[PDB]
């Protein structure tokens, strides 16, 4: 039930421990320790900025309007959520995360403009 | 299509590149470099805090309930969005941004209290 305890569990089980890991992301001699702390903050903020760009700010589970390409993975839901742990899944689609991230950004950019014109 | 590429374009064109600039805001000898990095983070967080205060957290385009005073600028939409680049616009209303920011804060404070009493 602690940090990374679910690392060996199935994706559908591990997805219930997202707050366990989220809370462990934040907290001349002594300078390299400041560099490590500053860097940890910068890393954290980049992931948070990215979620904001995709329209997922403030949440751990975020649904989008980006469809899945089976060229990315053609496994079904029982193969992915009831087997392939998150470590296994990450390896399998590592080659596609930049394509997916680009498509999440493009979608949010269309959504924010369509919503401003409906408030007009 | 890169960072600040749209700086010379019209406001209505440049507004479509907001993620290009947002992503370039984050990333004894060596101390002044830590000071620069810490300062960059602090600057970033103040702008993000301010958007949160105004009720614009998590978005690049945010509509508000604050009306425009033509004492701030009496130009129409074709003058502003189809000419005056953002650099030109920023110069023209620089004298009024603190008045506008104060009015955005006051509005959000009334909105959050009206919404808590409707959930009661």
């Amino acid at each position: 039930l602690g940090f990374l305890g679910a690392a060996g569990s199935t994706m559908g089980a591990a997805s219930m421990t997202l707050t366990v890991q989220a809370r462990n992301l934040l907290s001349h001699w002594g300078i390299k320790q400041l560099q490590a702390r500053v860097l940890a903050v910068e890393h954290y903020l980049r992931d948070q900025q990215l979620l904001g760009i995709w329209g997922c700010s403030g949440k751990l589970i975020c649904c989008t309007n980006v469809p899945w390409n089976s060229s990315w993975s053609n496994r079904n839901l029982s193969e992915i959520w009831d087997n392939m742990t998150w470590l296994q899944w990450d390896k399998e689609i590592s080659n596609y995360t930049q394509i997916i991230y680009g498509l999440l950004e493009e979608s949010q950019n269309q959504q924010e403009k369509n919503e401003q014109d409906l408030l007009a | 299509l890169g960072f600040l590429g749209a700086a010379g374009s019209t406001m209505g064109a440049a507004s479509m590149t907001l993620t290009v600039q947002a992503r370039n805001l984050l990333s004894h000898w060596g101390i002044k470099q830590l000071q620069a990095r810490v300062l960059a983070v602090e600057h970033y967080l103040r702008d993000q805090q301010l958007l949160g205060i105004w009720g614009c957290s998590g978005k690049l385009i945010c509509c508000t309930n604050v009306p425009w005073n033509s004492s701030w600028s009496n130009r129409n939409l074709s003058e502003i969005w189809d000419n005056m680049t953002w650099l030109q616009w920023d110069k023209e209303i620089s004298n009024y941004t603190q008045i506008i920011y104060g009015l955005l804060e006051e509005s959000q404070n009334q909105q959050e209290k009206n919404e808590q009493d409707l959930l009661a």
Partner: antibody
Framework: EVQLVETGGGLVQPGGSLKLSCRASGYTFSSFAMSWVRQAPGKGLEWVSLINDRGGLTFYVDSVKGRFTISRDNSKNTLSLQMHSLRDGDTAVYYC??????????????????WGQGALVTVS | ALTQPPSVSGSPGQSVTISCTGT?????????VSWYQQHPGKAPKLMIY???QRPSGVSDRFSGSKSGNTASLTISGLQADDEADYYC???????????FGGGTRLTVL
């Protein structure tokens, strides 16, 4: 000079389908919202559908809401309407018109600036 | 949806008024009333928009106005060539975007 030319269909059986299309020239197509306005042979004008200049937002009159699709192609300057289930009550002249909406950073419309001549759609 | 009279008429040189009465969540809520001129056999032409404005390309003999839930089109120096079906329309919200009246068959005597 702005021209909107309907190049759609004619006679269709009840319960069938018919697609209309309209070619635009003389203006920047992509700068304007467009709509379809219908006129039954013995009646006045009725608004049927509206589409955004970027093609993302569509609106319909309730009477065709689950039956008609309005679309747009900004590369080919083409407006189109796909009609399904075609009731006898859908017989009318269908006009291609420019207007009905703006994009927030533009002055508003809420009126129709340009009209085509209209395709006659007959359901028998 | 909107009510406007049939058969408005008058002789050349006389003015005529074509009325358009709607409802509160219509003409009474938004100042977006437009008028169109349709000669039989032709597509409608825009004459008036935003209650009082006219597009470039039309004469100043055509002037719009409104009060309460009623809008109207005034034609001043009436000409024989003004015979047409005049229609009013209005923006009526984001649920029922546009509504129209029936046509007014303006006849010049």
């Amino acid at each position: 000079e702005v021209q909107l030319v309907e190049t759609g269909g004619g006679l269709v059986q009840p319960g069938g389908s018919l697609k209309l299309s309209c070619r635009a020239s003389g203006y920047t197509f992509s700068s304007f919202a467009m709509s379809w306005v219908r006129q039954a042979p013995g009646k006045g004008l009725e608004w049927v559908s509206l589409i955004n200049d970027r093609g993302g937002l569509t609106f319909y009159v309730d009477s065709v809401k689950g039956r008609f699709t309005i679309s747009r192609d900004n590369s080919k300057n083409t407006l189109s309407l796909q009609m399904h289930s075609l009731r006898d009550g859908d017989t009318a002249v269908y006009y291609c018109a420019t207007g009905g909406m703006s994009s927030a950073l533009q002055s508003s419309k809420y009126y129709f600036d340009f009209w085509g001549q209209g395709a006659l759609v007959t359901v028998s | 949806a909107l009510t406007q009279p049939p058969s408005v008429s008058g002789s050349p040189g006389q003015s005529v008024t074509i009325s358009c009465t709607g409802t509160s969540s219509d003409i009474g809520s938004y100042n977006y009333v437009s008028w169109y001129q349709q000669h039989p056999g032709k597509a409608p032409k825009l004459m008036i928009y935003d209650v009082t404005q006219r597009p470039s390309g039309v004469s100043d003999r055509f002037s719009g106005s409104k009060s309460g839930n009623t809008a109207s089109l005034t034609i001043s120096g009436l000409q024989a060539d003004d015979e047409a079906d005049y229609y009013c329309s209005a923006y009526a919200g984001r649920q029922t975007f546009y509504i129209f009246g029936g046509g007014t068959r303006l006849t010049v005597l």
